Ligand binder design. Structure first.
Ligand SMILES: C[C@@H]1CN(c2cc(-c3n[nH]c4ccc(OC5(C)CC5)cc34)ncn2)C[C@H](C)O1
Ligand SMILES: Nc1nc2c(ncn2[C@@H]2O[C@H](COP(=O)(O)OP(=O)(O)O)[C@@H](O)[C@H]2O)c(=O)[nH]1
Length: 1792
């Protein structure tokens, strides 16, 4: 019982008894392992806390419900640091967790954090219980198992400021951008007044930039000077570029105490005290993996434009930066609201040369801005400068160049220019209010004046009489009358919008003038080219004048260079033929004249014309179906210059109805005697026949009209519209037996004749007198004549079987009607064509005398062979029109239609192919009607069955829409309550025949409605009724309402949100058809009234449901109700939104947020407010509730086009796309993002100082991404060029830099056009080329612009670095070539080019130099003393004897010169500060140490001949003699340090100061190094044999560290071999011959503190991409050389074809950059041409071209990397990830 009694007695013993009871139970707990005390021993703790002597015991006994934990920490917290009782506690926790894992989560539940934080931070480090502390890292490692536990405790770890532990947690993961995304870590960390080290650690690791900006706003709220300067240093600083990009931020005020540390400071050097955190992180990681596995120096200018600086005086003082400003050389203050530029500032900075501050609110040009030392381009161009701007004459500033004064409120030209600004060039004064006549203006160097938009009366006669270099005087929009003796030097003169009456003779005589724009003048006579006295006229812009003649008869060749001639809006009469001499004409413009009417054939010689607007003028020809475009018009005018002839050979379409005198009247018109077939049957198809008529009269014109006796029976009634062209003479026939009743039923036919060919004649012909009613002439005169039916021109009553004069009269009438057609007096029947067409027609007809009957088609190859067989003058560009024209004449049908596919096949003999297309429509099936009537599958010879229905369903006969269930099946809509449906009518007098056949076939195949779920559809002849659901369905019905002889087209669609989509997408397909095939219907006949024959109604009802009637409304009149949005009757209390009865016209269908209310508008449209022109309209700027927002206004255009654009540009959200904000119906225009820094063309035109390669690459990458998305959206751009790319910010590493405008071409932007997909790739190639070029492609657009598609694969293209001089930039120079394949199949995809652009290597490298063929070189030395242009001196080893091998870099010219009798090993540079020379030294195989001068390759003197092979040379920094001093080291193959002095090199056989024999004959000296710092007096370290050594100015071995005696043998010879390399840093990194591992010694302890293996980094990559590497287990690959950067990383040069980056501080591998060489032999650092700190890499590329001959072809591929690589490989890495998250977050807005 003792256990039971002891426990219960200790329980009841509330006073005193516990102190002993606990000792009794702690002794007894070991022996029986007893069994119900835990609860009571728990209870007693609460029952009396606070007694240490029992607390320790209780904790000791807990280890032998959750309230347990609640007492534990509350104990350890109540005894934080009283004694080592925490030991017993943490032992208890460690015991409990290892058996109950989840209890750990319970511990952190209560208070664990409070006490563990305290213990790990109560200064426990270097206190004696370091082993107890090891148990506690062991605790934490299991504590931080759950990542969420890391994040939330991290949250708590920043609440209380604790730098060491927050750093430790960051090293353990625990991302710092997860808390709230609106109030995430940095926000409260700057709110709670934390420490700079706490904020810096948060910023350095993952911290989203938006949160940083929010925290910047917060920390601006308070006054903090060490947290602000750390937020800016991560938000705005480009250290690579020396910048401050503080642009977008809304900083309330700038104070130098913030930017203080942003400027570079040489004193900045900080120790390593946070190593505690790294050590603790290492211990935690160790315990975690154990628990896991088996348990000068001045910056550039400043960001300043849009900051609304109401004052800039803050910088005028003598503050911290008042000495860095003195070398600014560019200052931008435009668009702020400044005033009165501070006088102290404008003399503080004495090197400013682009000061521009416009759009500010100045009111007085300071006139003390001009006392700066070297200023130019002074620009104040939108301020409110006072009425006069006189310059004070006490300033003599000559350096000013471009003194802009645009758009001020001036009243005079500035007064004292001539005495102040002498060298002034571009004095601009436009937009002012200059009124009075100007000054004599004695400026000696004006080069571009300007006076536009002033109010000038006239110019003084001595205005330009003293400015002998003016070039571009341009006074637009003034009130100007004459010109005052312009100096003979003007080149460009622009004088538009003035008030002239004739070109003043002061212009007709300028001896060098080049362009003259005088548009919008009211002038009368344009003097002939014999009045212009100038040999170089290029542009002559004269639009909007009143010009009568275009005098060119006098002397035309004197204007042979003219390239632009704009004469629009003039009273011209005709173009004189002398215009044919201006061969260099490029852009003629004679539009809007309304009185020109004819083009002379002479213009066909002006082949350079690429545009020729034809707006509002009528020509002979110009008929759209045959009308040419651009050069095609010139080709037409040139072929018409050759020879145009009368063609005289037309058509007669006979038309009947189911029976009449048609065939028996055609067989009587043709007088056909044969009667071969004694019994003709009903007509099949159209049966084309032809019959010549040599009219035996004075007119010998033997006219041949072809008769097409159309099908009578109604069954053929769908194809006939195809054979009714506009050019014809139709008959029609009665069968007068059913007189006055058949004549009624003939009405549809005439109607169709009025539908297709409005201006075609018709001839009625009675066909029966033998069969009996002849009063039919009544009704044809009574009803049929002139009411909506075509221009009947006769009627006859022949027998059409035999014996009468009436037939002769019918013949005469037909002949005389044919010879009298002449529509619009154009006379079709004899019009002129090139004889080539007639020849082609003749040869084709003669092949109607030779073809296969089974397949009358001709292949295009056969046609191009038959043109060769004859002597036709046609090329591959003539046939595309030739065959079309011959199609127009009924010779052969060929299909070029975009709706189908272009036919390689040619349908000569149409007479049987029309016969073939109708066979299917007559074959029936009286077998088993297994399918509903009309639908059928493939059921019928040699491959012809394939082409038959490869034509017929291309002909949309497939399921035959004809003979298809005329009676409609009964259909009921889910909802028919008069208010959930939308209904639209199409009342028309009679359906077109193939209307339904082609209507149900256009709606049918559009399956992806509201995209890919197909609907169920049950479609009879005249209806569809698709359905997805009761939420989406459509019934395009066909009913006739009672007492309505017309025929309607009822469409019903639910008024739901998606139903409006159905409506719109169906009305588009029903309207576009009507204007594509039936232009007669939707042709408003102003003659009579606007019937339009197509009265598209709209049905609306006020009474929601049970309206008892649907109220009509004509759609046009409803469209007139667009000034509002709601319709309402004469009774105005109730109304229906137009948004409820026609949601398709209505704006709301795309995301509803697009709506412009016309309320909070803010706008202007003057010629400053547009931003550019493009496609179908232009774009302007305005504001609304916004500030700046762009508006795309439209021309002329239509709400067809806009509906396309609305949908297609919407529903597409992408970072590279220019998203639109709103649309405006009333204002007929759209709204877009304002592109802040301009367009790419502008950027190229101006800003070439500021295009970094990074930046160019960013733009290209952004663009590559947009184009990729556009192909994700499966579509062409078709508009890619500098004019179309928009730039937002000029900050290189931003998130949005470039975007792409208007969507699916130019001489400056050509391709081999598909119609003359993969094409946009090529267009991108052009843009990319120019971006690489920076303005080379169309600067030539001022010069030789036709040449832009002439050298198409052939131009400056072969070497554009060479052809433009731009900075070399490989990989992408290969990318454009490799992209730019002429064949579209050969081009890579846009996704592929985007992926290749997303490659840090494409951004990081600039050149290599493949040395001459088979040269082996193994040593090289750079030159930094002449840092202007440097040459890299190489050795050789292709020869066993020594050649030196010079190699320059700016010329890349290799030279060879044998200088030694034995192969060289190494060289070095010893430059002497005296005598200004750099002796170059070379050590060799024989020991013959050679020294040769820099410039002289003859003053050579080998020094003492060494004993063994010299392995090394080196030049040190040893100034130990109180002066500048240097030495030289000769590493030989034995260790003998033959040291010398910097100057003693000249004397033959130099004297070694201290000959230090170090190594042995078997231990070869093999590497030397200097130290990393200079504070250790440059202790020198050199490897020797296998033991590294060191020395100093003493030149005595200071250490004999041995490496072979290593205690970590994984292999021996990797350390048991001769040393190869040594580098001196905080530690030592060493490698040996063929050692694939590097050894890391320490200088003090001399211990192998590191062992870093190379193939330890080769595995990770090879495993996927090298499968043959599984056979290469005995791997080649080892450290062939070392090269260490200053403090960032270390570059391992492999013996293989690889290179390794090592971040020596924290993470081992940054990147391996392979596949660029095969053996990295040499590596070193250097400086070149102010591009200091480059790293040269001499690698090998062996070619086994003759490897079978045991020989390899060697190319020493010397490359030059930019040493800044280890940053960009980790910084650009990051930059992708940024844009990847943003790629996804943006696509969330597409979801919702
Ligand atoms: C420098 C000036 C130039 N600017 C622009 C803006 C734009 C522009 N923005 N948004 C657009 C949307 C469409 C668009 O279609 C083009 C390419 C057809 C002209 C242009 C812009 N295009 C040139 N320049 C903006 C102002 C503030 O700055
Ligand atoms: N007796 C008689 N028959 C005629 C006359 N004109 C046409 N027909 C008949 O019309 C038929 C000619 O075919 P047509 O009607 O032109 O062919 P369809 O239009 O394809 O049916 C023959 O059967 C003729 O006998 C006429 O004046 N007298």
């Amino acid at each position: 019982h003792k256990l039971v009694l002891a426990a219960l007695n200790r329980f009841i013993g509330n006073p005193g008894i516990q102190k002993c009871g606990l000792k009794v139970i702690s002794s007894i707990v070991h022996f029986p392992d007893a069994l119900g005390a835990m609860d009571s021993v728990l209870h007693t703790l609460q029952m009396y806390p606070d007694d240490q002597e029992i607390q320790c015991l209780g904790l000791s006994l807990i280890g032998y419900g959750h309230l347990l934990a609640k007492i534990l920490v509350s104990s350890l917290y109540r005894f934080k640091d009283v004694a080592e009782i925490q030991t017993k506690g943490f032992q208890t926790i460690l015991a409990i967790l290892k058996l109950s894992a989840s209890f750990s989560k319970l511990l952190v539940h209560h208070s664990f954090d409070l006490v563990i934080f305290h213990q790990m931070s109560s200064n426990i480090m270097e206190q004696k219980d370091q082993q107890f502390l090891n148990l506690c890292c062991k605790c934490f490692a299991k504590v931080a198992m759950d990542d969420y536990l890391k994040n939330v405790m991290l949250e708590r770890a920043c609440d209380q400021n604790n730098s060491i532990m927050v750093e430790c947690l960051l090293l353990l993961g625990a991302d710092a951008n997860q808390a709230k995304e609106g109030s995430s870590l940095i926000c409260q960390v700057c709110e709670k007044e934390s420490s700079p080290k706490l904020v810096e650690l948060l910023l350095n690791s993952g911290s989203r930039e938006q949160d940083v900006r929010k925290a910047l706003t917060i920390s601006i709220g308070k006054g903090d000077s060490q947290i602000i300067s750390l937020l800016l240093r991560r938000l705005a600083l480009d250290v690579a570029n020396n910048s401050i990009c503080l642009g977008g931020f809304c900083i309330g005020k700038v104070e130098p105490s913030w930017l203080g540390p942003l400027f570079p400071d040489k004193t900045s050097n900080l120790r390593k005290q946070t190593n505690i955190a790294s050590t603790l992180a290492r211990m935690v990681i160790r315990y975690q993996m154990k628990s896991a596995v088996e348990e000068r120096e001045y910056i550039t200018s400043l960001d300043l434009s849009a900051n609304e600086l109401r004052d800039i005086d803050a910088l005028s003082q003598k503050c911290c930066i008042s000495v860095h400003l003195e070398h600014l050389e560019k200052l931008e203050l435009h668009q702020n609201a400044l005033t009165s530029f501070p006088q102290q500032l404008c003399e503080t900075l004495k090197s400013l040369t682009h000061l521009d501050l416009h759009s500010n609110k100045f009111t007085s040009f300071p006139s003390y801005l001009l006392k700066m030392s070297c200023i130019a381009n002074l620009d104040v161009s939108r301020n409110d400068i006072g009425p006069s701007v006189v310059l004070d004459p006490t300033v003599k500033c000559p350096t000013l160049k471009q003194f802009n004064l645009s758009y001020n409120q001036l009243s005079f030209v500035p007064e004292n220019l001539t005495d102040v600004v002498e060298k002034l060039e571009q004095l601009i004064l436009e937009g002012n209010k200059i009124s009075g006549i100007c000054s004599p203006l004695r400026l000696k160097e004006l080069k571009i004046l300007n006076l536009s938009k002033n109010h000038i009366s006239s110019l003084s006669e001595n205005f330009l009489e003293a400015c002998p270099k003016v070039e571009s005087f341009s006074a637009r929009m003034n009130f100007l009358a004459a010109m005052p003796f312009l100096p003979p030097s003007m080149t460009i003169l622009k004088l538009s919008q003035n008030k002239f009456s004739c070109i003043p003779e002061a212009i007709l005589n300028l001896p060098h003038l080049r362009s003259l724009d005088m548009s919008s003048n009211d002038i009368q006579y344009l003097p002939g080219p014999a009045h212009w006295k100038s040999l170089n006229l290029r542009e002559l812009l004269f639009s909007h004048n009143q010009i009568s003649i275009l005098d060119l008869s006098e002397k035309a060749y004197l204007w042979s260079r003219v390239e632009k001639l704009h004469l629009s809006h003039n009273k011209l009469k005709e173009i004189p033929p002398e215009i044919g001499c201006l061969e260099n004409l490029t852009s003629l413009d004679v539009s809007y004249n309304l009185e020109l009417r004819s083009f002379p054939n002479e213009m066909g010689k002006l082949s350079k014309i690429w545009d020729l607007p034809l707006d509002e003028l009528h020509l002979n020809f110009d008929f759209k179906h045959i009308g040419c475009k651009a050069k095609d018009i010139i080709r037409f005018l040139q072929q018409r210059l050759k020879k145009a002839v009368p063609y005289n050979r037309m058509k007669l379409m006979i038309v009947g109805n189911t029976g009449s005198g048609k065939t028996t009247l055609l067989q009587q018109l043709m007088k056909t005697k044969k009667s071969d077939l004694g019994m003709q049957s009903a007509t099949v198809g159209i049966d084309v026949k032809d019959w010549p008529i040599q009219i035996r009269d004075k007119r010998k014109r033997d006219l041949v009209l072809n008769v097409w006796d159309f099908a009578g029976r109604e069954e053929f009634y769908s194809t006939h519209p195809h054979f009714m062209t506009q050019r014809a003479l139709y008959l029609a026939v009665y069968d007068l037996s059913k007189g006055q009743a058949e004549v009624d039923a003939m009405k549809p036919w005439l109607f169709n004749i009025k539908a297709r060919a409005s201006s075609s004649p018709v001839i009625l012909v009675g066909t029966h007198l033998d069969v009996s009613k002849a009063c039919m002439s009544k009704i044809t005169k009574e009803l049929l004549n002139k009411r909506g039916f075509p221009a009947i021109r006769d009627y006859h009553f022949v027998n059409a079987t035999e014996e009468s004069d009436a037939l002769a009269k019918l013949r005469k009438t037909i002949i005389n009607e044919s010879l009298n057609f002449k529509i619009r007096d154009q006379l079709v029947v004899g019009q002129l064509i090139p004889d080539c067409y007639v020849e082609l027609e003749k040869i084709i007809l003669s092949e109607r005398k030779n073809v296969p009957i089974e397949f009358p088609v001709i292949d295009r190859k056969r046609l191009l062979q038959l043109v060769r067989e004859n002597q036709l003058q046609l090329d591959e560009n003539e046939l595309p029109h030739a065959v079309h024209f011959l199609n127009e004449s009924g010779v052969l049908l060929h299909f070029q239609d975009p709706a189908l596919q272009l036919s390689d096949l040619y349908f000569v003999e149409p007479k049987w192919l029309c016969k073939i297309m109708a066979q299917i429509l007559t074959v029936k099936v009286e077998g088993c009607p297994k399918h509903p009537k009309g639908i059928i599958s493939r059921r019928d010879p040699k491959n012809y069955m394939s082409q038959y229905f490869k034509l017929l369903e291309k002909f949309q006969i497939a399921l035959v829409p004809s003979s298809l269930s005329d009676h409609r099946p009964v259909i009921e809509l889910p909802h028919c309550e008069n208010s959930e449906i939308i209904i639209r009518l199409y009342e028309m007098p009679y359906f077109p025949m193939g209307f339904w056949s082609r209507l149900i076939n256009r709606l049918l195949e559009i399956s992806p409605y509201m995209l890919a779920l197909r609907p169920n559809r049950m479609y009879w002849r005249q209806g569809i009724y698709l359905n997805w659901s009761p939420e989406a369905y459509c019934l395009v019905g066909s009913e006739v309402l009672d007492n309505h002889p017309e025929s309607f087209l009822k469409i019903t669609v639910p008024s739901c949100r998606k139903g409006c989509i159905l409506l719109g997408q169906v009305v588009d397909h029903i309207d576009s058809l009507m204007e594509e095939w039936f232009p007669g219907l939707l042709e408003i006949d102003i003659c009579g009234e606007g019937e339009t024959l197509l009265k598209k109604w709209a049905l609306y009802s006020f009474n929601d449901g049970e309206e008892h009637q649907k109220i009509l409304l004509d759609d046009l009149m409803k469209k007139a109700e667009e000034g509002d949005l709601l319709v309402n009757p004469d009774q105005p209390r109730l109304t229906i939104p137009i948004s409820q009865i026609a949601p398709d016209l209505i704006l709301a269908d795309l995301p509803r947020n697009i709506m412009l209310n016309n309320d909070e508008l803010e706008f202007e449209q003057a010629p400053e407010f547009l931003l550019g022109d493009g496609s179908f309209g232009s774009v302007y700027r305005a504001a609304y509730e916004g500030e700046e927002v762009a508006v795309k206004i439209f021309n002329h255009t239509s709400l067809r086009l806009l509906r396309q654009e609305l949908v297609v540009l919407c529903h597409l959200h992408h970072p590279s796309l220019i998203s639109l904000l709103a649309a405006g119906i009333r204002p007929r225009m759209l709204v877009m993002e304002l592109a802040s820094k301009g367009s790419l063309d502008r950027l190229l035109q101006q800003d070439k100082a500021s295009l970094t390669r990074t930046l160019q690459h960013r733009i290209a990458l952004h663009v590559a991404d947009g184009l990729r998305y556009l192909h994700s959206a499966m579509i062409i751009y078709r508009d890619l060029k500098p004019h179309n790319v928009l730039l937002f910010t000029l900050y290189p590493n931003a998130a949005i830099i470039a975007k792409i405008a208007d969507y699916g071409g130019t001489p400056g932007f050509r391709a081999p056009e598909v119609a003359r997909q993969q094409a946009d790739v090529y267009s991108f190639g052009l843009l990319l080329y120019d971006i690489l070029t920076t303005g080379g492609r169309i600067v030539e657009g001022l010069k030789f612009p036709n040449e832009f598609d002439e050298l198409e694969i052939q131009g400056k293209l072969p070497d554009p670095v060479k052809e433009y001089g731009c900075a070399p930039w490989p990989m992408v120079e290969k990318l454009i070539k490799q992209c730019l394949k002429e064949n579209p199949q050969e081009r890579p995809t846009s996704a592929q080019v985007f992926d290749i652009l997303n490659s840090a290597e494409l951004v990081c490298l600039t050149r290599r130099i493949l040395l001459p063929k088979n040269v082996i070189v193994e040593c090289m030395v750079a030159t930094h003393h002449n840092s202007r242009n440097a040459s890299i001196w190489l050795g050789c080893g292709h020869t066993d004897r020594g050649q030196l091998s010079f190699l320059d870099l700016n010329t890349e010219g290799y030279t060879s010169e044998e200088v030694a009798d034995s192969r060289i090993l190494c060289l070095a540079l010893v430059h002497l500060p005296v005598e200004k020379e750099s002796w170059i030294v070379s050590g060799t195989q024989s020991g013959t140490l050679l020294v040769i001068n820099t410039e002289d390759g003859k003053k050579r003197h080998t020094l003492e001949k060494m004993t063994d092979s010299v392995t090394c040379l080196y030049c040190n920094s040893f100034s130990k003699q109180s002066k500048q001093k240097n030495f030289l080291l000769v590493g030989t193959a034995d260790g003998k340090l033959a040291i010398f002095e910097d100057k003693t090199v000249k004397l033959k056989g130099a004297a070694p100061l201290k000959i230090l024999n170090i190594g042995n004959v078997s231990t070869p000296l093999m590497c030397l190094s200097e130290s990393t710092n200079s504070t250790e007096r440059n202790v020198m370290w050199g490897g020797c044999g296998t033991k590294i050594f060191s020395f100093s100015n003493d030149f005595t071995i200071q250490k004999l560290i041995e490496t072979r005696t290593s205690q970590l043998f994984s292999y021996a010879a990797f350390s048991d071999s001769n040393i190869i390399t040594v580098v001196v840093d905080t530690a030592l990194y060493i490698a040996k011959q063929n050692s694939p591992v590097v050894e890391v010694w320490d200088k003090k302890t001399e211990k192998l503190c590191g062992l870093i293996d190379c193939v330890h980094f080769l595995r990770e990559v090879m495993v996927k991409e090298n499968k043959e590497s599984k056979h290469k287990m005995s791997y080649s690959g080892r450290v062939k050389t070392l090269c260490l950067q200053k403090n960032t990383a270390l570059w391992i040069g492999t013996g293989g074809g690889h290179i390794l980056l090592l971040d020596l501080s924290t993470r081992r591998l940054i990147r391996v950059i392979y596949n660029f060489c095969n053996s990295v032999r040499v590596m070193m650092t250097a400086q070149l041409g102010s591009l200091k700190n480059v790293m040269l890499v001499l690698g090998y590329n062996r070619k086994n071209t003759e490897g079978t001959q045991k020989q390899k072809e060697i190319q020493s591929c010397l490359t030059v990397w930019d040493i800044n690589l280890p940053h960009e490989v980790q910084n650009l890495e990051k930059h992708i990830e940024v844009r990847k998250e943003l790629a996804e977050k943006m696509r969330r807005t597409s979801v919702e």
